[PDB]
Amino acid sequence: KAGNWLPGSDAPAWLPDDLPGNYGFDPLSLGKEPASLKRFTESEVIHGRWAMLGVAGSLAVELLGYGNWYDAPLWAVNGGKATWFGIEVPFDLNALLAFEFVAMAAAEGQRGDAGGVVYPGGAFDPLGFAKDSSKSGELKLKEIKNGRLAMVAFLGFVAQHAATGKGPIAALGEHLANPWGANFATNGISVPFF
Amino acid sequence: KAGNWLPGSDAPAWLPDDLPGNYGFDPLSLGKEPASLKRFTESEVIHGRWAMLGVAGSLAVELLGYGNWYDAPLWAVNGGKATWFGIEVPFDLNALLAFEFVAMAAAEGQRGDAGGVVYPGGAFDPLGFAKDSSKSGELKLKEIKNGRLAMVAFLGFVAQHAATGKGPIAALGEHLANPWGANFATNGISVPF
Amino acid sequence: NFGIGHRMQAILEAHTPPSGSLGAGHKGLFDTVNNSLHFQLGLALASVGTITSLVAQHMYSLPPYAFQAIDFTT
Amino acid sequence: MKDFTTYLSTAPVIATIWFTFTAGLLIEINRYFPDPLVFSF
Amino acid sequence: DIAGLTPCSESKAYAKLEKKELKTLEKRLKQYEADSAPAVALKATMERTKARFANYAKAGLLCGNDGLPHLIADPGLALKYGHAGEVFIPTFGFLYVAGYIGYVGRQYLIAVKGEAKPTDKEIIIDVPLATKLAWQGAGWPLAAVQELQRGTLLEKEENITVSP
Amino acid sequence: RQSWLPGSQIPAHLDTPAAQALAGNFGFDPLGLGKDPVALRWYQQAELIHCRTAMAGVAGILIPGLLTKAGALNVPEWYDAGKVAIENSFAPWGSLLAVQLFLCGFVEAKRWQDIRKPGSQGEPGSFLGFEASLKGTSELGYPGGPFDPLGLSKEADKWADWKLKEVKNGRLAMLAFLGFVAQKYATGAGPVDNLAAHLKDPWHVNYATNGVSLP
Amino acid sequence: DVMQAFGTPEKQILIEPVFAQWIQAAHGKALYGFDFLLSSKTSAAFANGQSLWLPGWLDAINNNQNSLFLTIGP
Ligand code: CLA
Ligand code: CLA
Ligand SMILES: CC(/C=C/C=C(C)/C=C/[C@@]12O[C@]1(C)C[C@@H](O)CC2(C)C)=C\C=C\C=C(C)\C=C\C=C(C)\C=C\[C@@]12O[C@]1(C)C[C@@H](O)CC2(C)C
Ligand SMILES: CC(/C=C/C=C(C)/C=C/[C@@]12O[C@]1(C)C[C@@H](O)CC2(C)C)=C\C=C\C=C(C)\C=C\C=C(C)\C=C\[C@@]12O[C@]1(C)C[C@@H](O)CC2(C)C
């Protein structure tokens, strides 16, 4: 278990207590059937993985000073010459679009319809952490926690840029500058009247 | 089975579950009789193969830059000089018309009225994929799905060019350009109001 | 009488659509078209009476004869 | 007058009351709404 | 101008025919005293006539070369060009009342079949049953499609034939 | 049983135990439209959805209408918000209606199939694990699952209370929209403008001072 | 007849023969303006027969003094 998400409320019967990241949070009974819970326990981890990579990419561009996450796919219109660490990339839109359509499918289709695995031991642990003896569930819990926080962070990125038109650091600095005039309410979007 | 096409509906009894490409989709009871259904299964695969070849021919011309699928048989009127990979063809209309009349019937009529076969093992599998051991129906199902998608793609080519006068990529680039003003409602044809 | 061609006894009793479309289709007509003269006379009169209306409709709009449709009474 | 109301419910009496009703409805309509060739608004 | 036609507010044969009818009414009116009972009815006929021409020109009816309004009886040439009130709106305003009467009479027959002798309530119509079926037949297309989905609209081959 | 007219004989197909245990049954069917039980089963769905869409629409008319006449919004009239907001729009109306009919038809055909056979969308393998919460409840018209996020159905007491509150607010909103259309046709003003016109002179400014109650 | 008797010819039901005027305009009668196949100068059935059989047929329909596709009304 390790958590109750709303104290005093009961835990549902269809959530196993040994499952990593468990709190009992299913107010829709959305994973009630075990096949759907088995599909969603695989897909939450993968959303968390790709969102941790997404928040690291969206923050490292601004911490390294190369624009933001929003304007990084803005060279395909109104010019070109994409960069990475300052190194130029001589690729147009259609070539890298086809390479992302092909070279990712050769790993996605190799992952997905070859089973239902979500923690594959072996080559994906080069250093060696998950020998599944004692520290399996603890590292899985930390991965789930950090990934859920990253999904919340990326949805905050999307809403923050849709409301203010700025980057993550570019308005975290404003919230640190004017803490009472640079929040989600002083814009005329998220709070409709006041 | 592998699919229900409108979930919760009952499957019609005249479709076997072992048949490749199955969903139960027959809302007109159109293939109810077995002698008709066997010929429909034998004809759906061949419509799928010829439409996969049709969509590959309609797309590779524009992806290689040689006009479209529409203007490629437009040298028969107002000029000539047919091309293929840039290589010129010194043939008129009537000679290749008779060659398609004669040389194709030696494959079509040899295929058709020599039985009812639709997956013939032997010379049509040089590398070896369909040994009918474990992965027969899987590859048959993939062939059915890709062929049905190609048939829908070719009818989309027909209606798209009959409504906009443009080719496949010549309007896919526009739908990627103006995604709310370059669809099937902004023309005055498909939606009459 | 020469081996090639088509036969009236084989084309009729094979054009039968299944699943209760036309019932048994055209099975048994050659025993009744050939043996009946009133059936043959009825089909012949239907064809002649329709292509006579066709002659009438197409000889006024498309007059085939020289200086017809100036002679209005004709 | 139960027999009189069964007489009033016979076929020609209902016919001549209902046809005067559906006549004098359409007649009052064509008085208050003259000449309806086309469905206007 | 759909099929060689013209709007009646545009054509001049329509206005000439209006002036023709008003001319006949005027030369008919010239015989009477201006406040007498025939002259009031003649001027009322003129007012109904002019209101009729104004409301036929207002609705956008199409005149021909004859100066007479025409009816475009095709949806897609009436819906596209604004002539749906010619035929396409009264072709459902009729059929509601037609299927209404055909449903009320149907239900009056079926609700009188299962009695002692039905024929006496066909020459002597049961008026409270008739008016109950007259009022509750207002939603007839609803009940007609709900009856068609059963198969209780049709009857099977229990029907009476001769010698097939 | 708290009927719409206290002295009427209620129609007997609204006094069955299938129909008395139905939401908002006040014995009102003077034209016999639900005499077949499956006709009534269909029209109960039609009433629920005609009333939920009307509650959403009438809220979207008079909540910004009352927040326009009291300031701090500038939402126009409901019969003017199609003329405007097509200029402040990424799309014209035709493409928008086409996307609307696709996204809404995918919903409405699943609802069609669930009405014609209950629990249809809950059969496994339909969606990607999402179909398990699509059986609805034991009765049709009230699905729950993903459509009850706050969880007001897990009570089994005061549930007919919530049903009857939904049905009565919905019937009132359907009458309100038929209102909005008619009080637009009659005098050409807005609904809150008509409310202010009635409240400043009730005994002279009403539907007896226009041409629609004409003798 | 009742409208002609009451002196009101405008109240007649004069349904225009839309379905056959469309066939005349698809055959090349440019009097109605449906411009569908042969009365439209830009179509393919018009264009692929200008040397073969069309111009005499188009000059014969649009003559209003033969019986070749008479103009029609209610
Ligand atoms: C052509 C390459 C390719 C292929 C074949 C696959 C194939 C697959 N991916 Mg994959 N993926 C790819 C590229 C590809 N992906 C790329 C490039 C990325 C990075 C962006 C990902 C990221 C990714 C994640 C994170 C996950 C998968 C998953 C899956 C599997 C589920 C199949 C499915 O449902 O289709 C998906 C088909 C769609 C049409 C996707 C619909 C659009 C999604 C929902 C995004 C929309 C977000 C939207 C805001 C939310 C909905 C609205 C909401 C606000 C109400 C399947 C094996 C999932 C999995 O394994 O499940 C267990 C999973 O968790 N992939
Ligand atoms: C099938 C052939 C046919 C057709 C299509 C028409 C069509 C028409 N005729 Mg014509 N006519 C015909 C045959 C036909 N006629 C014949 C054979 C004759 C000689 C007898 C005439 C003599 C004739 C005359 C003398 C006149 C017409 C008129 C008309 C027009 C009808 C206007 C009208 O009354 O609105 C009726 C409109 C309605 C909406 C009526 C519907 C009834 C109500 C509103 C619906 C029910 C409401 C409510 C539920 C009822 C309450 C129920 C109660 C129990 C409480 C219309 C163009 C009139 C006209 O204007 O000419 C153009 C006119 O003056 N006709
Ligand atoms: C928020 C989210 C999911 C939210 C879902 C929630 C809360 C659902 C909760 C519930 O279901 C449960 C749990 C239980 C139910 O009973 C109840 C509810 C409440 C319904 C997923 C985000 C998931 C977000 C993901 C996966 C984001 C990945 C981001 C990537 C890959 C970004 C890449 C880039 O940023 C870089 C790297 C560089 C840039 O230049 C380019 C781009 C491309 C922009
Ligand atoms: C779409 C299609 C069939 C669609 C039928 C459907 C959906 C029927 C569905 C139903 O029946 C079922 C299933 C069940 C019933 O109860 C109900 C319905 C709903 C009725 C066939 C297309 C079939 C399409 C085919 C076979 C297309 C072949 C295309 C070719 C050969 C193109 C060649 C060229 O493009 C090149 C190569 C080069 C160019 O330069 C020259 C040309 C000539 C243009």
Ligand SMILES: CC(/C=C/C=C(C)/C=C/[C@@]12O[C@]1(C)C[C@@H](O)CC2(C)C)=C\C=C\C=C(C)\C=C\C=C(C)\C=C\[C@@]12O[C@]1(C)C[C@@H](O)CC2(C)C
């Ligand atoms: C659904 C509905 C309205 C929905 C409105 C919507 C979505 C509005 C949306 C918009 O406004 C916004 C948001 C913003 C605007 O800018 C745009 C639009 C688009 C305009 C009204 C239903 C309105 C439905 C009504 C009024 C139905 C009335 C039916 C009655 C009274 C029938 C009674 C009987 O049938 C019984 C019960 C029994 C029989 O025996 C007897 C009789 C009498 C026959």
Ligand SMILES: CC1=C(/C=C/C(C)=C/C=C/C(C)=C\C=C\C=C(C)\C=C\C=C(C)\C=C\C2=C(C)CCCC2(C)C)C(C)(C)CCC1
């Ligand atoms: C749009 C339109 C049109 C067209 C039309 C059409 C084309 C139609 C078709 C139609 C059809 C195609 C039909 C069919 C049918 C079939 C059937 C089969 C039917 C049946 C019916 C019935 C059966 C009924 C019954 C009933 C009821 C329900 C009510 C009353 C009573 C009774 C019982 C009688 C026109 C232009 C002309 C005009 C305008 C409109």
